[PDB]
Amino acid sequence: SKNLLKKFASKTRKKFWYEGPSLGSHLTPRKKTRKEDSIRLRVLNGLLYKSLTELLCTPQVSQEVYDLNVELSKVSVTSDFSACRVYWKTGVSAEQNKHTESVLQRSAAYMRHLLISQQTLRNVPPIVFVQDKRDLVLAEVDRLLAEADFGPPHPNLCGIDHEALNKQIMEYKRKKEHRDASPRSFLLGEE
Amino acid sequence: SRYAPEFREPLIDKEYYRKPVAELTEEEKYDQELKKTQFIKAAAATETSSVFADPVISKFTNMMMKGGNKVLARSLMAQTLEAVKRKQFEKYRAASAEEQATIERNPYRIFHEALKNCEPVIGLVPILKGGHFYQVPVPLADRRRRFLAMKWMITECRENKPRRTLMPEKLSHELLEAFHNRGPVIKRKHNMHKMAEANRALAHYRWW
Amino acid sequence: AKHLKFIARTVMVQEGNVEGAYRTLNRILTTDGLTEVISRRRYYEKPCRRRQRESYETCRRIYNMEMARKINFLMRKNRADPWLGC
Amino acid sequence: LHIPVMVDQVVHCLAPQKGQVFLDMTFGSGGHTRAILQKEPDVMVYALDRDPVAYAIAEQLSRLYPTQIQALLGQFSQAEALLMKAGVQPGTIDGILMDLGCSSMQLDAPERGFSLRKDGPLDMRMDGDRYPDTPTASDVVNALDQQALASILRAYGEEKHAKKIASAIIQARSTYPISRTQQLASIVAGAFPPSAVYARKDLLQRSTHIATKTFQALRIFVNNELNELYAGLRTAEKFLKTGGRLVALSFHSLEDRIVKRFLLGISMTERFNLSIRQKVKQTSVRAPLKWELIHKKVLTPEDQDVQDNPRGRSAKLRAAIKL
Amino acid sequence: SRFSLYPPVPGQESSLQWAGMKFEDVPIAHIKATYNNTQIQVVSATNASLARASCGTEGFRNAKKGTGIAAQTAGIAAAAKATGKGVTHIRVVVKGMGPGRWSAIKGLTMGGLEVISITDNTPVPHXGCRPRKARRL
RNA sequence: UUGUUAGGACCUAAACUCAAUAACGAAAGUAAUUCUAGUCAUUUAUAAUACACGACAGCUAAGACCCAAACUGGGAUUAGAUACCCCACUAUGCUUAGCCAUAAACCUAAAUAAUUAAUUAACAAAACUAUUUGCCAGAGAACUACUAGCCAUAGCUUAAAACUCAAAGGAC
Ligand SMILES: Nc1ncnc2c1ncn2[C@@H]1O[C@H](CSCC[C@H](N)C(=O)O)[C@@H](O)[C@H]1O
Ligand SMILES: [K+]
Ligand SMILES: [Mg+2]
Ligand SMILES: [Mg+2]
Ligand SMILES: [Mg+2]
Ligand SMILES: [Mg+2]
Ligand SMILES: [Mg+2]
Ligand SMILES: [Mg+2]
Ligand SMILES: [Mg+2]
């Protein structure tokens, strides 16, 4: 009789859904921007964010990776869908991050297998693990700072050039001291 | 440029070409075979196989040249090196046997260790955020770190010297003072680093 | 207040990995919805506002879950071309 | 008569006491200076003004207190030299009172040209015969082009209608010289229809003339009060004792901004946004504050009192201690 | 034969000790992480105050008082006072969801204290007091 | 003041998760738990000048008071800021009696029984037949003037004309 979902069913149907049995060219393993592509890539980034967190903090990948307990900063797939860029949260310790980077990357192939096997995502492209460049720079600006040595222990204000205006005044003081488209032509015979 | 992108920079290392074939890494061995089917840029007028050619000093010469006067700029560098060699020989002869050991009389080695003492690890980039100019601590590359040391030297001598002193006499007196970590060019490095600590928390504004 | 302390929302640190334990506690609170609940209790959401948000989030979850099904369903046919050249 | 407005707040803020040296950079009629010398008869005070008439008033009033008040004549910029000629006797000044605006005597007297309501020559110059070559408002209106003249109205008078008002002056001066205050008022009131002559109601809920902004603009430009004020506050800080209390009264926003920005470490140089994407919030500073603001909180006089002195309605009292 | 995330059940007998004390005896580090100030207090298992700190007491002011690095300094300060009093193991009950929620726990670790567990006690009313009105921006 | 209390009091106020549910009721509205009372048969549609209801705000008297909060005061911002932001605190939101009778009270869908083909103005929510009542007749003037009724008195319901215009309005 009264359905709360009716209010927003038609609005969310153009924002979060497209019609027709068409899959994108990118989504294949091997142009003009479309709205369906934005939907087809937004949902994958959410599924992979949900599904790639069910591997890092779960025991399937490995015992060391399970112990790593890697939370993820964000997941973002390329528009071409050639590969993925799984950003991961990066602790302050640079050395540990370097080791964690290598560990995750080695299991990238197996992690993909785990998702593809479970059937959450049928055709997942190769995965990558990247460190946020912002985080790396902030760490580097701290490393170099520690290494670094600090050594041994009026008219223009208001906006009117009062001086120039005074000269202009003193200088002045020195001087002081729809019709042709009708059928008329056709109906007369002027051809 | 009149060179097409397919041209390769020339390799002017005399020993590299005459090395025995087995002494070359296969990566280097592969490049040599590839280069046989490529175009090579002509060598620069100042690019030679001379054993006395130092890239760092040649670069420092070009940063002093004004209006393409290479003869004058090279003469100024030649006079400087000599003024440094003559200044250390005087000290060496007028020093005890124990002190004589420490004294360094190589001008080429005083120049390189001088510049390296002036190089700064971190620099600053000027940024206008919300209509206010802020300079954020940046980590300097190997190229930016080297350029700043040479630029700071050529600017202390050009400007902050007496009117009748000459560049071979101010530059020689500064390479040696930087060589001992006492000069004003070193003081510029210390100020740059000290300011970075002041703006330590303002690096977040970086977007590049 | 009348319950027992240190049973609810408590995690134990393993081998002095205090960061790993904190990361686990956050996933527990986020999964149970406490994080979202505490976020929205800072200010007051009006009853009409609350209903509009819940109806939109429900419809967004339906269309998202349905779009996942359609991609997964249509991704089975995603394979090397068998009739290359025709 | 014009009672010194908000003098009680100044007197309490200054707390004039024996053995303290004070300065007044705007003696004028001397009402404020006399109030400081009444609370404490043993206080030491120095007076200054740009008007030779005002200086004579101080010299005449120096008989009342032979050494407690010291009279001086000159601008804010020339104040440092005048106090330097005296020597180090001002030295560590406990308080500098920088009241602003036109003197009660200056604007009450029609001959001085400050009053548009009365008919007098268009002098509008606080300086008297001390400098006879200082251009008057008559020279300013008759000499400057629309571009220059409009900027004076827009920048110093906050004139909303700057191009129309400026053009009327340029046309009127060509027809006849603009030499009288009422002549200029009619010229400004002629750029618009007759309805707008007396229409611009104020926050007071009292109507005002349409050329009040032109007289304020010319008053500040002829005497360059704003630029000279920038140097007066800077010289007061130099001559202000550490722990000394500064007290200023700002009757319009332009002077208030310089006093408001100065006492909070902000700079008048700061560029201006123009009602597009202003970052009041972001959805920092070179150095910290250099003052202990006894009364950062500002207020106008009481509305009942304002009726008695409408000229002082917008008086904002800004008090600070040197750091 | 595995580690249990679940705290030793109170009232029973367990095989886990820390410096010869049971779980019920380890001192507690109460961290209140708000959006402006992060306070920290350490108490004994009998509810006796041992250390106290906060971004404000360390000397931060205004918006600096509510940063991650400000809470880290406050945690290091609380650790040092507690370490002097004779504390090596702490149970971290972290109330609040502010910026220095984690940083305060990191400072305590940097200060030489060994956290054995982390509890969360952020107040969650079950229906309670009407929150203040939404801010318009 | 603050933090902790596996200390005491309070029973004011409001009912997380469940709820990704779509139930109950004429509508308004209603979801912490328990118990008591309780919804039900007129063939069906069709009612006002009658009767009984009717969110929130508001009024009347006596209480309550954790938190929220018109107004007001204080602080910022601004050319100004009677605002947006910060802080404090009222009317008020609560209970018990009575009044008030208004909502974008909107599924912007009167009810009921059929049909899905011999049917695209557009958009929304596919089209369409029959029955009964209500309502509409260019826009503004006009949720207005006057009239009558009303616990309503700066109120509600009922509701014009002069005069002005050649458009107003809906969808794409
Ligand atoms: N730049 C400047 N330098 C010096 N005096 C100035 C000045 N600008 C304005 N004045 C003077 O300062 C006074 C401000 S109005 C008068 C206030 C004075 N305290 C009194 O009791 O009368 C006037 O006398 C005015 O001529
Ligand atoms: K509706
Ligand atoms: Mg206010
Ligand atoms: Mg109340
Ligand atoms: Mg109605
Ligand atoms: Mg409703
Ligand atoms: Mg109405
Ligand atoms: Mg009516
Ligand atoms: Mg009526």
Short mmCIF file of N, CA and C in Angstrom, two decimals, chain B residues 121-176:
data_model
loop_
_atom_site.label_atom_id
_atom_site.label_comp_id
_atom_site.label_asym_id
_atom_site.label_seq_id
_atom_site.Cartn_x
_atom_site.Cartn_y
_atom_site.Cartn_z
N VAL B 121 70.49 18.92 1.88
CA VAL B 121 69.68 17.72 1.68
C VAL B 121 68.23 18.09 1.35
N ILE B 122 67.69 19.12 2.00
CA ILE B 122 66.30 19.52 1.83
C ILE B 122 66.23 20.98 1.42
N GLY B 123 65.25 21.30 0.58
CA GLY B 123 65.02 22.66 0.13
C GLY B 123 63.63 23.17 0.48
N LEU B 124 63.20 24.25 -0.17
CA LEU B 124 61.87 24.80 0.04
C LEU B 124 61.25 25.18 -1.31
N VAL B 125 59.95 24.94 -1.43
CA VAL B 125 59.17 25.32 -2.61
C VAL B 125 58.14 26.36 -2.19
N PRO B 126 58.06 27.51 -2.86
CA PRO B 126 57.09 28.54 -2.45
C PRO B 126 55.69 28.21 -2.95
N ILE B 127 54.71 28.27 -2.04
CA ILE B 127 53.34 27.87 -2.32
C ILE B 127 52.39 28.95 -1.82
N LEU B 128 51.37 29.24 -2.63
CA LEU B 128 50.31 30.19 -2.28
C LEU B 128 49.03 29.41 -2.00
N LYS B 129 48.72 29.21 -0.72
CA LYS B 129 47.52 28.51 -0.29
C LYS B 129 46.58 29.51 0.37
N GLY B 130 45.38 29.64 -0.17
CA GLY B 130 44.43 30.62 0.36
C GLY B 130 44.96 32.03 0.34
N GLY B 131 45.61 32.43 -0.75
CA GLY B 131 46.12 33.79 -0.87
C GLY B 131 47.16 34.14 0.16
N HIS B 132 48.00 33.18 0.55
CA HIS B 132 49.13 33.44 1.42
C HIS B 132 50.29 32.56 0.99
N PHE B 133 51.49 33.14 0.94
CA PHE B 133 52.67 32.44 0.44
C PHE B 133 53.32 31.65 1.57
N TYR B 134 53.35 30.33 1.41
CA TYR B 134 54.03 29.43 2.34
C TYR B 134 55.06 28.62 1.57
N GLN B 135 56.19 28.36 2.20
CA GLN B 135 57.24 27.52 1.64
C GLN B 135 57.31 26.22 2.43
N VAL B 136 57.17 25.10 1.73
CA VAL B 136 57.01 23.79 2.36
C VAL B 136 58.33 23.04 2.27
N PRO B 137 58.79 22.39 3.33
CA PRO B 137 60.00 21.56 3.23
C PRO B 137 59.86 20.52 2.13
N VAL B 138 60.88 20.42 1.29
CA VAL B 138 60.90 19.46 0.19
C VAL B 138 62.16 18.62 0.29
N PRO B 139 62.14 17.35 -0.15
CA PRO B 139 63.40 16.60 -0.28
C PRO B 139 64.02 16.79 -1.66
N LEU B 140 65.26 17.24 -1.71
CA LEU B 140 65.90 17.63 -2.96
C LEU B 140 66.53 16.43 -3.65
N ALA B 141 66.38 16.39 -4.97
CA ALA B 141 66.99 15.35 -5.78
C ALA B 141 68.51 15.54 -5.82
N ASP B 142 69.20 14.57 -6.44
CA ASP B 142 70.64 14.70 -6.60
C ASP B 142 71.00 15.85 -7.54
N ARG B 143 70.12 16.17 -8.49
CA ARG B 143 70.41 17.26 -9.42
C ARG B 143 70.15 18.61 -8.77
N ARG B 144 69.03 18.74 -8.05
CA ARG B 144 68.72 20.00 -7.39
C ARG B 144 69.69 20.27 -6.25
N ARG B 145 70.17 19.22 -5.58
CA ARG B 145 71.09 19.40 -4.47
C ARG B 145 72.45 19.87 -4.96
N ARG B 146 72.88 19.40 -6.13
CA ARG B 146 74.17 19.81 -6.68
C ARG B 146 74.10 21.22 -7.24
N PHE B 147 73.03 21.54 -7.97
CA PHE B 147 72.88 22.87 -8.55
C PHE B 147 72.94 23.96 -7.49
N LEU B 148 72.29 23.74 -6.35
CA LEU B 148 72.20 24.80 -5.35
C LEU B 148 73.55 25.12 -4.74
N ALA B 149 74.41 24.11 -4.57
CA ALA B 149 75.74 24.36 -4.01
C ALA B 149 76.57 25.24 -4.95
N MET B 150 76.56 24.93 -6.25
CA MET B 150 77.31 25.73 -7.21
C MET B 150 76.71 27.12 -7.35
N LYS B 151 75.38 27.21 -7.36
CA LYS B 151 74.72 28.50 -7.49
C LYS B 151 75.03 29.40 -6.30
N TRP B 152 75.06 28.82 -5.10
CA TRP B 152 75.33 29.62 -3.90
C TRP B 152 76.76 30.12 -3.87
N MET B 153 77.70 29.35 -4.43
CA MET B 153 79.09 29.79 -4.48
C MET B 153 79.26 30.93 -5.48
N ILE B 154 78.75 30.76 -6.70
CA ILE B 154 78.93 31.77 -7.73
C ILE B 154 78.23 33.07 -7.38
N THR B 155 77.32 33.06 -6.41
CA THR B 155 76.58 34.25 -6.02
C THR B 155 77.20 34.96 -4.83
N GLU B 156 77.82 34.22 -3.91
CA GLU B 156 78.55 34.86 -2.82
C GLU B 156 79.75 35.64 -3.34
N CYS B 157 80.48 35.06 -4.29
CA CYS B 157 81.67 35.71 -4.82
C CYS B 157 81.31 36.88 -5.73
N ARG B 158 80.31 36.71 -6.59
CA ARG B 158 79.98 37.76 -7.54
C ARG B 158 79.54 39.03 -6.83
N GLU B 159 78.80 38.89 -5.73
CA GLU B 159 78.19 40.03 -5.06
C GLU B 159 78.95 40.45 -3.81
N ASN B 160 79.10 39.54 -2.85
CA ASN B 160 79.62 39.88 -1.52
C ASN B 160 81.15 39.82 -1.48
N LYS B 161 81.78 40.69 -2.26
CA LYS B 161 83.22 40.82 -2.26
C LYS B 161 83.59 42.29 -2.40
N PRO B 162 84.77 42.68 -1.93
CA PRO B 162 85.22 44.06 -2.14
C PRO B 162 85.29 44.41 -3.62
N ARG B 163 85.31 45.72 -3.89
CA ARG B 163 85.24 46.18 -5.27
C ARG B 163 86.51 45.85 -6.05
N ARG B 164 87.66 45.87 -5.39
CA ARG B 164 88.93 45.68 -6.08
C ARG B 164 89.43 44.24 -6.03
N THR B 165 88.82 43.39 -5.21
CA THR B 165 89.15 41.97 -5.25
C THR B 165 88.63 41.35 -6.54
N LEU B 166 89.27 40.26 -6.95
CA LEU B 166 88.93 39.59 -8.19
C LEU B 166 88.36 38.21 -7.89
N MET B 167 87.62 37.67 -8.86
CA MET B 167 86.94 36.40 -8.63
C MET B 167 87.90 35.26 -8.34
N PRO B 168 89.06 35.15 -9.00
CA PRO B 168 90.00 34.09 -8.64
C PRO B 168 90.51 34.20 -7.21
N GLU B 169 90.42 35.38 -6.61
CA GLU B 169 90.89 35.60 -5.25
C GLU B 169 89.79 35.46 -4.21
N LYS B 170 88.54 35.70 -4.60
CA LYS B 170 87.39 35.47 -3.73
C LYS B 170 86.91 34.03 -3.81
N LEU B 171 86.91 33.46 -5.01
CA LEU B 171 86.46 32.08 -5.18
C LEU B 171 87.46 31.11 -4.56
N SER B 172 88.75 31.34 -4.79
CA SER B 172 89.77 30.52 -4.13
C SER B 172 89.65 30.61 -2.62
N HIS B 173 89.43 31.82 -2.09
CA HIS B 173 89.30 31.99 -0.65
C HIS B 173 88.02 31.40 -0.10
N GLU B 174 87.04 31.09 -0.96
CA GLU B 174 85.77 30.53 -0.53
C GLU B 174 85.73 29.02 -0.69
N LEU B 175 86.29 28.49 -1.78
CA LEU B 175 86.44 27.05 -1.91
C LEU B 175 87.22 26.48 -0.74
N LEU B 176 88.28 27.18 -0.32
CA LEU B 176 89.08 26.70 0.80
C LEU B 176 88.35 26.85 2.13
#
